[PDB]
Design a protein around this ligand. Structure first.
Ligand SMILES: [Mg+2]
Ligand SMILES: [Mg+2]
Ligand SMILES: [Mg+2]
Ligand SMILES: [Mg+2]
Ligand SMILES: [Mg+2]
Ligand SMILES: [Mg+2]
Ligand SMILES: [Mg+2]
Ligand SMILES: [Mg+2]
Ligand SMILES: [Mg+2]
Ligand SMILES: [Mg+2]
Ligand SMILES: [Mg+2]
Ligand SMILES: [Mg+2]
Ligand SMILES: [Mg+2]
Ligand SMILES: [Mg+2]
Ligand SMILES: [Mg+2]
Ligand SMILES: [Mg+2]
Ligand SMILES: [Mg+2]
Ligand SMILES: [Mg+2]
Ligand SMILES: [Mg+2]
Ligand SMILES: [Mg+2]
Ligand SMILES: [Mg+2]
Ligand SMILES: [Mg+2]
Ligand SMILES: [Mg+2]
Ligand SMILES: [Mg+2]
Ligand SMILES: [Mg+2]
Ligand SMILES: [Mg+2]
Ligand SMILES: [Mg+2]
Ligand SMILES: [Mg+2]
Ligand SMILES: [Mg+2]
Ligand SMILES: [Mg+2]
Ligand SMILES: [Mg+2]
Ligand SMILES: [Mg+2]
Ligand SMILES: [Mg+2]
Ligand SMILES: [Mg+2]
Ligand SMILES: [Mg+2]
Ligand SMILES: [Mg+2]
Lengths: 116, 56, 92, 136, 75
RNA sequence: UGCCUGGCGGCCGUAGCGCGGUGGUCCCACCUGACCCCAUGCCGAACUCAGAAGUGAAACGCCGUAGCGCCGAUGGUAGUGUGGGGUCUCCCCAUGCGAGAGUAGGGAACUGCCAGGCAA
RNA sequence: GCUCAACGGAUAAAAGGUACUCCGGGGAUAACAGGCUGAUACCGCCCAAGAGUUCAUAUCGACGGCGGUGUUUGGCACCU
RNA sequence: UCCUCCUAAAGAGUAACGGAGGAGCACGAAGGUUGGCUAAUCCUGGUCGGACAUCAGGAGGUUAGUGCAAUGGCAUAAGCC
RNA sequence: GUGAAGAGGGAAACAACCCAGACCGCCAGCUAAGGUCCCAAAGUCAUGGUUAAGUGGGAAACGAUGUGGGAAGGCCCAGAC
């Protein structure tokens, strides 16, 4: 069972980060598709959300689940987040090891404008 | 509405609490008709020393 | 197997013991969608009624304020050493 | 002579024999010997009572013992002063409250039952009574 | 006799109880293992000691999947 | 509007197990291979990347089931604060408070923020 | 730089005898006797497995139990 | 002298020549941090190999582990690389 | 809590038990514990029962047609003990 191993891997960062009261950028990498969303410090309501599941994003891209797509999501989070009125957030990788698609998302997020 | 309290026993071999409660009611010595207004507190203070007091 | 039983008004340790020391003892009826009803009843009768086995199986028609309630004796609290009943749990 | 086969601790506090017992109903057998009075049975008394019971009802009649000592009693040696440690363990005792069923018995008549328990009850220090298992 | 030794007592337990107002830095609970856990505006010292990280009143609660006593502060 | 999934919670067992089925239009899950980025203290099993032929087999989600765990009165019982009394290694009475255990029953949950796709 | 461990460390440095004794005190603390207690002791009883040719109870009486006395060995240290 | 449990009467504290146990250190990795893993004990199979070495799965699930006593802790692991 | 450091009344006498806290006086009254036939202040008081042991006015296991109370079941006019 992967999921339950990934949750307890991700719990420390979550509990540590929610204690400070930081607006956190949560990411969920799937084998096909990738999800990203900014959650309020209370940990209840989503401020901004973005993924390759949206047809506006999917019609432009070639394949939905790679670095050059995750970068385009990471950009789309940053472009919305500035319009909504957000700038300072904290990245929550959520068990997924920071290296590939998530790094391509993060780099694309902080290259675009979002501040973390 | 008033309630006339009286002391009917000694305050000698009593507990510090019960020596205090009489001090709160204003019962100095045996045979002392005091009058206090009826409240939830005062009835609690009577009830706390019910043995050594009387209501009128 | 009819027993004339009274409804309680006082209840608690102080009441239960004053009752239990008067050739009577407390019991209770419950079960179904109806409300649970507390019972005062005579000791001497119910002490003799439980001699037979039928008491712990058959239906008992307990008479209360005219009305006959059909019940079965679920549980009973024996007195620690003396041969006597402290409490009965009747089920409807 | 009954005794705990190994324990956590050697010496135990005196405590206080208080309240009422739990093993009140006759569980296994048909008849039993209930303790009316308060007290404490030694390991010797239980054996001594069991011997007198078993011998009264012959080979037949199954017996159960509900009590077990598991509480070591100390004693100071003779001609020794107070203090200087706690005394050494002499005998073991079960504390007995009112309404503790001590012994049970099954596979005999009520006529021959009571006569067995009357012999046992004489060996014990506690005031006792005969009791019967009832259907609920 | 191979007995008659004992340590000095520590003065452990709770010092500030539910609803009591505390100042930043005040010790709330002084315990050995984390029997109480740090919540909002509470830290945990190297001695497993729960102390206020802000001014306000003490709130004892029970939360989490495994069900543990969390201490928190709200101003 | 509902019917479904996904993440994120809240609530921390009436919410969890064992059984009984059921989902693949998307969705997720195996899956698919491994110039590559990265990976193994041996291993693409794990993490990772490139993917889109398959099956919903494992896992999951949902529906139904009490076979369990769990929740749980009313009444009584133990205990006990205060003041008395006794036959005073322990009990009893007035007056508060009042368990645990147990029983009748309830019970396989319940709801927030966005994101898709199907009947409109 | 100290088992200053007699661990708030009296000195850097310290064991014994006294029936040859002495002074100051103490019934704050022992020996004798008294007191309180009664484990022990001694004296009774309860149960009755057996002994007693047979038959527990003429005489005995295991295993255990319940008392009395203040006659032992003691405990306590209340009087001196 | 110091530490842990009980005595200790559900805040702290609490005596006895009361009941049980320990310490007079250890470590430049056994500290720091970042990424990943999760135990005991059984069961069945398998060369030398047996009740027990190493391997594979399944049951159990934290009955382990925590540099040294006991207590209170620990899966977000304070456990293990 | 009391004594110590608190007298007084009661428990025959009895620091610590029960009742109650003495500023001084009075040949006044009402009460607490405890009492009320005589020593010795006050009920040979009233109502219905218990005890016959001088219990009351030291005590256990255990023993026994001692005696006073309710509640059920056993047997009779085919006439029981
Ligand atoms: Mg008094
Ligand atoms: Mg109540
Ligand atoms: Mg101490
Ligand atoms: Mg300490
Ligand atoms: Mg399936
Ligand atoms: Mg209740
Ligand atoms: Mg309950
Ligand atoms: Mg010193
Ligand atoms: Mg010191
Ligand atoms: Mg000479
Ligand atoms: Mg000289
Ligand atoms: Mg001299
Ligand atoms: Mg002296
Ligand atoms: Mg003296
Ligand atoms: Mg002295
Ligand atoms: Mg001295
Ligand atoms: Mg002497
Ligand atoms: Mg003498
Ligand atoms: Mg002597
Ligand atoms: Mg002495
Ligand atoms: Mg002394
Ligand atoms: Mg003298
Ligand atoms: Mg304490
Ligand atoms: Mg306390
Ligand atoms: Mg000590
Ligand atoms: Mg880590
Ligand atoms: Mg570490
Ligand atoms: Mg003095
Ligand atoms: Mg007088
Ligand atoms: Mg006099
Ligand atoms: Mg005296
Ligand atoms: Mg007294
Ligand atoms: Mg009195
Ligand atoms: Mg008189
Ligand atoms: Mg005179
Ligand atoms: Mg007179």
């Amino acid at each position: 069972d992967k999921k339950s191993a990934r949750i307890r891997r991700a719990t420390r960062a979550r509990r540590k980060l929610q204690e400070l009261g930081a607006t956190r950028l949560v990411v969920h990498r799937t084998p096909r598709h990738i999800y990203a969303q900014v959650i309020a410090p209370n940990g209840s309501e989503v401020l901004v959300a973005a993924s390759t599941v949206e047809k506006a994003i999917a019609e432009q891209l070639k394949y939905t689940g790679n670095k050059d797509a995750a970068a385009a999501v990471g950009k789309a989070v940053a472009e919305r987040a500035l319009e909504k009125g957000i700038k300072d957030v904290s990245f929550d990788r959520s068990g997924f090891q920071y290296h590939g698609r998530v790094q391509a998302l993060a780099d694309a997020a902080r290259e675009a404008g979002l501040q973390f | 509405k008033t309630i006339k309290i009286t002391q009917t026993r000694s305050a000698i071999g009593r507990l510090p609490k019960h020596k205090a409660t009489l001090l709160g009611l204003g019962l100095r010595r045996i045979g002392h008709t005091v009058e206090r207004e009826d409240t939830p507190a005062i009835r609690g203070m009577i009830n706390a020393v019910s043995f050594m007091v009387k209501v009128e | 197997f009819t027993i004339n039983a009274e409804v309680r008004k006082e209840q608690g340790k102080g009441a239960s013991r004053r009752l239990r020391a008067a050739n009577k003892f407390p019991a209770i009826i419950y079960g179904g969608k109806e409300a649970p009803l507390a019972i005062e009843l005579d000791h001497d009768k119910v002490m003799n009624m439980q001699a037979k086995a039928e008491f712990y199986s058959e239906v008992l028609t307990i008479v209360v304020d005219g009305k006959e309630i059909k019940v079965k004796a679920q549980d009973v609290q024996r007195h620690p050493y003396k041969p006597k009943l402290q409490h009965i749990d009747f089920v409807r | 002579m009954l005794q705990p086969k190994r324990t956590k601790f050697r010496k135990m506090h005196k405590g206080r024999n208080r309240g009422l017992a739990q093993g009140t109903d006759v569980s296994f057998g048909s008849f039993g010997l209930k303790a009316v009075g308060r007290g404490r049975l030694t390991a010797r008394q239980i054996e001594a009572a069991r011997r007198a019971m078993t011998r009264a009802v012959k080979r037949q009649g199954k017996i159960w013992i509900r009590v077990f000592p598991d509480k070591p009693i100390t004693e100071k040696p003779l001609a020794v002063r107070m203090g200087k440690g706690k005394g050494n363990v002499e005998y073991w005792v079960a504390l007995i409250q009112p309404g503790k069923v001590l012994y049970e018995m099954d596979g005999v008549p009520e006529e021959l039952a009571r006569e067995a328990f009357k012999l046992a009850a004489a060996k014990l220090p506690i005031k006792t009574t005969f009791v019967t298992k009832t259907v609920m | 006799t191979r007995n008659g030794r004992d340590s000095e007592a520590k003065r452990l337990g709770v010092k500030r109880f539910g609803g009591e107002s505390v100042l930043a830095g005040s010790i709330i609970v002084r315990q050995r293992g984390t029997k109480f856990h740090a919540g909002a505006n509470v830290g945990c010292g190297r001695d497993h000691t729960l102390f206020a990280k802000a001014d306000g009143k003490v709130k004892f609660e029970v939360k989490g999947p495994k069900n543990r006593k969390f201490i928190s502060i709200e101003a």
